[PDB]
């Protein structure tokens, strides 16, 4: 029950601003070394900012003058203020508690920051109807959205084995697309109904799509 | 009769930075020329006073503070710096009048297995005031549960060792530091450069 | 001032094997290194600090060692869930922390043939004016596979996009989707849509096909 929960990521136009936040529990942020570390898509880790329990702050050269790390002791929360964002700040940002010589022991789940001129667009969800013996495959086509990420679960999470949600591919139009599939016993097509739940928070899109033969 | 700088600069053992030693220097003549004319100091930075004029000057009290840190921390022994040394171990005031002298001591303070005698404070809630010295070893509380003097999760011994090895990069090698502060008070001046004997 | 270089950049090994990953520092640091494990979609997980101390909760099969400039992480008896990117970190007691570039470790296993399925476009998407045809290759090893689209026996080039899953943490397999995208109008011009799959786990290629409107 030591956790760090990030929020505030999303799409922003280059030269705009964004503040991230990191609610902590199971230690006191004002009493700890705390860090932000970022990871550009498919790339390595890059330290961003450090704050001391005594109040001093320190920044990587690539963000100094634009980012500001801070905290709020009553809300036990860590902040990153980002100004004058550029395309190369696109990354998922992690907060982490630093035991400097004992390493970075607890990390947030991460939060994606996309800086881009492209407008947001919600997905269209289309069924991949099963074929019907033995085993059957079915799923959902999540087409034409921006930006990343989308979440897809099946039957509100009551179905996890056999599931493959593929990483999005950027299409020529500049929009993302993906499929989520699942394999099930052919007999269960008569027994179990199958709904894929698609959430695209940037566009406020919640879609439930029943997939039938 | 001369001020005992040899007792400070040439001491066999230096203090850990968190338990920095302070030597009060009074009632004596201080020849500073043996310092700024040495070439065996890699840092000799003065503030609010000129080197090459110290032999012409007088002061009420002189303090000689001395300790060991690693080379790339030396820049934190300066007014207005931040970092784990300036914040939690040894803090210079903004209006500091004096000199900071340092030199590489890898041949004296590194061990083959790593020297673990020299320490710094790593965990502390707030910054030190200038010239404050904190030698507490109380278990540091990083969370809401009291430690009751036992080391565990969120409950950390606050001091850590440098582990000086002769194969460290120069920025991570041990450096001996002497800080001279010059006290000019509303009292007689009992420390003078030789030109003012 | 400190750069950490990990080697090799990529590595594959079989379960039960012993695996060794190297981190080289440009200058002498001294046991001030940590190792992290990062699985896809997850935050890094501390495995080792001070170059050799096991973080609490980490399985005993992870061990580390080294001093100065040369460090190693070792997995004693590799397990399928160890598929990850491994990172070293300089544990600098002053700000400029720095990480290695990462070492992607993939699990080697026996050949497994893919199961192939084909999905016609839905009629709701045809109403939109576009048609996607999806070929699914399920739970195969190794990752290399060819997927060739044929439309009335004409090989298609330049209108399909592929996507592969990260290696599976239980059985070390991959899954792949290939999506062929056409306009409604062009989709209506042809009858036989097929997906031909080549893979070393298949003695001859496998075609799955459907006739539009059946
Ligand atoms: C620290 O000790 C050394 C002893 O080697 C002092 O330096 C020597 O002093 C004598 C007498 O003045 C000279 O003849 C030598 O040439 C000096 N050797 C050097 C400078 O390498 C040194 O002065 C002492 N430091 C202080 C502050 O007293």
> Cα torsion for C49, B106, B67, B172, to the nearest 10°?
-40
Distance CA A84, CA B43 (A): 39
Q: Whole domain around residue A84: which residue ranges?
A: 3-115
Distance CA C102, CA C99 (A): 8
Tokens, residue C202: 């298949």
Q: Are residues A19 and A53 in the same domain?
A: yes
Tokens, residue C151: 């439309």
Residue A23's CATH number: 2.60.40.10
Q: Are residues A176 and A130 in the same domain?
A: yes
Residues 62-101 of A with CB under 8 A from B: 99-101
Which residues does chain A have within 8 Å of residue B161's beta carbon, measured at their own beta carbons? none
User: Which residue(s) pair with A71 in the sheet?
Assistant: A78
The three-class DSSP label of residue C165 is: coil
Radius of gyration of chain C measured on its C-alpha atoms: 23
State which of B7, B8, B9 you would mutate to test the pocket of ligand 1, scoring each by most atoms of that ligand within 8 A of its C-beta. B9
Q: Are residues A109 and A149 in the same domain?
A: no
Domain ranges of chain C: 4-108, 115-211
Q: Are A163 and A178 in contact (CB under 8 A)?
A: no
Ligand 1 neighbour B5 (Cβ under 6 A): yes
Residue nearest to atom 27 of ligand 1 (CA): B6
**Experimental technique of record:** X-ray
Distance CA B41, CA A47 (A): 34
Q: Are A179 and A137 in contact (CB under 8 A)?
A: no
Distance CA B74, CA B11 (A): 19
Instruction: Establish whether the linkage from the previous residue to B172 is cis, with ω within 30° of 0.
Output: no
Q: State the DSSP code for A121.
A: B
Tokens, residue B133: 């010295």
Instruction: Give CA separation, C182 vs A49, C129, C131, C209, in Å.
Output: 47, 9, 5, 16
Domain count, chain A: 2
B156 membership: H or E segment, kind and range? strand B155-156
B70 membership: H or E segment, kind and range? strand B61-70
For chain A, count helices (H), then strands (E): 1, 19
Q: What is the resolution of this structure in A?
A: 2.2
**What are the start-end ranges of the H helices in B102-168?**
106-109
Tokens, residue C173: 């397999």
Residue linked to tokens 């278990």: B139
CATH class of C4-108: mainly beta
Distance CA B180, CA B97 (A): 8
Give residue A175 CA to ligand 1 midpoint distance, Å: 75
Q: Are residues A76 and A159 in the same domain?
A: no
Q: State the DSSP code for C134.
A: E
Binary contact (C93, B114; C-beta < 8 A)? no
Among residues A62, A91, A115, which one ends one of the domains? A115
Q: Are residues A130 and A191 in the same domain?
A: yes
Distance CA B181, CA B47 (A): 10
* Nearest alpha carbon to residue C88 among C78, C101, C75: C101
Q: Are residues A84 and A130 in the same domain?
A: no
Ligand 1 neighbour B34 (Cβ under 6 A): yes
State which of B3, B8, B34 you would mutate to test the pocket of ligand 1, scoring each by most atoms of that ligand within 8 A of its C-beta. B34
> Residue A166 is nearest to which of C100, C117, C177, comparing CB atoms?
C177
Q: Are residues A145 and A176 in the same domain?
A: yes
User: Which residue(s) pair with A24 in the sheet?
Assistant: A4
In chain C, the DSSP E strands lie at: 4-7, 10-14, 19-25, 33-38, 45-49, 53-54, 62-67, 70-75, 84-90, 98-99, 103-108, 115-119, 130-140, 146-151, 154-155, 160-164, 174-183, 192-198, 206-211
> Residue A32 is nearest to which of B88, B142, B144, comparing CB atoms?
B142
Q: What are chain B's domains?
A: 6-196 (3.30.70.1840)
Q: Are A203 and A120 in contact (CB under 8 A)?
A: yes
Binary contact (B114, C27; C-beta < 8 A)? no
Binary contact (C27, B171; C-beta < 8 A)? yes
Among residues A115, A149, A182, which one ends one of the domains? A115
Q: Are residues A102 and A18 in the same domain?
A: yes
Distance CA A135, CA A165 (A): 18
Q: Are A173 and A133 in contact (CB under 8 A)?
A: no
Distance CA A112, CA A48 (A): 15
Q: Which fold has domain C115-211?
A: Immunoglobulin-like (2.60.40)
Q: Are residues A92 and A150 in the same domain?
A: no
Residue nearest to atom 3 of ligand 1 (CA): B10
> Residue A171 is nearest to which of C134, C136, C161, comparing CB atoms?
C161
Residue linked to tokens 């709701």: C124
Residue linked to tokens 């920044």: A59
Give residue C43 CA to ligand 1 midpoint distance, Å: 57
Q: Which of B89, B171, B173 to mutate to test the interface with C (most CBs of C within 10 A)?
A: B171
Q: Are residues A99 and A154 in the same domain?
A: no
Tokens, residue C9: 């950049």
A112 membership: H or E segment, kind and range? strand A111-115
Nearest 5°: the CA angle C44, C48, C52 is: 160
Instruction: Give CA separation, C41 vs A57, A155, C18, C38, C44, in Å.
Output: 29, 21, 26, 8, 10
**Beta strand B191-192 pairing with B28-29:** parallel
Ligand 1 neighbour B140 (Cβ under 6 A): no
Chain centre distance of CA B37:
21
Give residue B38 CA to ligand 1 midpoint distance, Å: 9
On whether any CB of chain A is under 8 Å from the CB of C157, the answer is no
Which residues does chain A have within 8 Å of residue B81's beta carbon, measured at their own beta carbons? none
Ligand 1 neighbour B10 (Cβ under 6 A): yes
- The count of other CB atoms within 10 Å of the CB of residue B95 is 9
Binary contact (C163, A166; C-beta < 8 A)? yes
Give residue B91 CA to ligand 1 midpoint distance, Å: 30
Residue linked to tokens 């570390």: A37
Distance CA B94, CA B83 (A): 15
Q: Are residues A181 and A149 in the same domain?
A: yes
Atom of ligand 1 nearest to the CA of B10: 1
How many Å lie between the alpha carbon of A90 and the closest alpha carbon of chain C?
A: 16
Tokens, residue B92: 């210079």
On whether any CB of chain A is under 8 Å from the CB of C119, the answer is yes
User: Which residue(s) pair with A98 in the sheet?
Assistant: A33, A104
* Buried b or exposed e, range A73-110, using 16+ CB within 10 angstroms: eeebbbbbebeebeeebbbbbbbbbbbbbbbbbbbbeb
Tokens, residue B63: 């303090």
Which chains does chain C touch, 3 or more C-beta pairs < 8 A?
A, B
> Residue A141 is nearest to which of C34, C117, C132, comparing CB atoms?
C132
CB-based contacts of C166: which residues, under 8 Å, 6+ apart?
A167, C40, C83
Binary contact (B83, A56; C-beta < 8 A)? yes
Q: Are residues A52 and A141 in the same domain?
A: no
Residue linked to tokens 């919600």: A122
Among residues A84, A115, A146, which one ends one of the domains? A115
């Amino acid at each position: 029950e030591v956790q760090l929960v990030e929020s505030g990521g999303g799409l922003i136009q280059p030269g705009g601003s964004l503040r991230l936040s990191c609610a902590a529990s199971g230690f006191i942020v004002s009493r700890n070394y705390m860090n932000w570390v970022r990871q550009a898509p498919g790339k390595g880790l890059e330290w961003v900012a450090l704050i001391y329990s005594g109040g001093s702050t320190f920044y990587a050269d690539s963000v100094k003058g634009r980012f500001t790390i801070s905290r709020d002791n009553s809300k036990n929360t860590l902040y990153l203020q980002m100004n004058s964002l550029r395309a190369e700040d696109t990354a998922v940002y992690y907060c982490a508690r630093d035991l400097v010589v004992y390493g970075l022991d607890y990390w947030g789940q991460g939060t994606l920051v996309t800086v881009s001129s492209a407008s947001t667009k919600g997905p269209s969800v289309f069924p991949l109807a099963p074929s019907s013996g033995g085993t059957a495959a079915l799923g959902c086509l999540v087409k034409d959205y921006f930006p990343e990420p989308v979440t897809v679960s099946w039957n509100s999470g009551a179905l996890t084995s056999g599931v493959h949600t593929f990483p999005a591919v950027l299409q020529s139009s500049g929009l993302y697309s993906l499929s989520s599939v699942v394999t099930v016993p052919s007999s269960s097509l008569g027994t179990q109904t199958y709904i894929c739940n698609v959430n695209h928070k940037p566009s406020n899109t919640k879609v439930d799509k029943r997939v039938e033969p | 009769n001369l001020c005992p700088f040899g007792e400070v600069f040439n001491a066999t053992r230096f203090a850990s930075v968190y338990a920095w030693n302070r030597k009060r220097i009074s009632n004596c003549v201080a020849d500073y020329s043996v310092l700024y004319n040495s070439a065996s100091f890699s840092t000799f930075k003065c503030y609010g006073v000129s080197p090459t004029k110290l032999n012409d000057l007088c002061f009420t009290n002189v303090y000689a503070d001395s300790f060991v840190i690693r080379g790339d921390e030396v820049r934190q022994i300066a007014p207005g710096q931040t970092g784990k040394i300036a914040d939690y171990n040894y803090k210079l005031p903004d209006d500091f009048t004096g000199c900071v002298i340092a030199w590489n001591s890898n041949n004296l303070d590194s061990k083959v297995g790593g020297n673990y005698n020299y320490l710094y404070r790593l965990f502390r809630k707030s910054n030190l005031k200038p010239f404050e010295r904190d030698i507490s070893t109380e278990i540091y509380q990083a969370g809401s549960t009291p430690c009751n003097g036992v080391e565990g999760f969120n409950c950390y011994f606050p001091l850590q060792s440098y582990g000086f090895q002769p194969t460290n990069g120069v920025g991570y090698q041990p450096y001996r530091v002497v800080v001279l502060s010059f006290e000019l008070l509303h009292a007689p001046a009992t420390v003078c450069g030789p030109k003012k004997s | 001032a400190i750069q950490l270089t990990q080697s090799p950049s990529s590595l594959s090994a079989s379960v039960g094997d012993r695996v060794t990953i190297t981190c080289r520092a440009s200058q002498g640091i001294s046991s001030h290194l940590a190792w992290y494990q990062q699985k896809p979609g997850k935050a890094p997980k501390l495995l080792i600090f001070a170059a050799s101390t096991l973080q609490s909760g980490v399985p005993s099969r992870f061990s580390g060692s080294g001093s100065g400039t040369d460090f190693t992480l070792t997995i004693s008896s590799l397990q399928p869930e160890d598929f990850a990117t491994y990172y070293c970190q300089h544990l600098n007691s002053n700000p400029p922390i720095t990480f290695g570039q990462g070492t992607r470790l993939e699990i080697k296993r026996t050949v497994a043939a893919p199961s192939v399925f084909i999905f016609p476009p839905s009629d709701e998407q045809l109403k939109s004016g576009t048609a996607s045809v999806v070929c699914l290759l399920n739970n195969f090893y190794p990752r290399e596979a060819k997927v060739q689209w044929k439309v009335d026996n004409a090989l298609q080039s330049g209108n399909s996009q592929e996507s592969v899953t990260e290696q599976d943490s239980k059985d070390s397999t991959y899954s792949l989707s290939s999506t062929l995208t056409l306009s409604k109008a062009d989709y209506e011009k042809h009858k036989v849509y097929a997906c031909e799959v080549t893979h070393q786990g298949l003695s001859s290629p496998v075609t799955k096909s459907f006739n539009r409107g059946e």
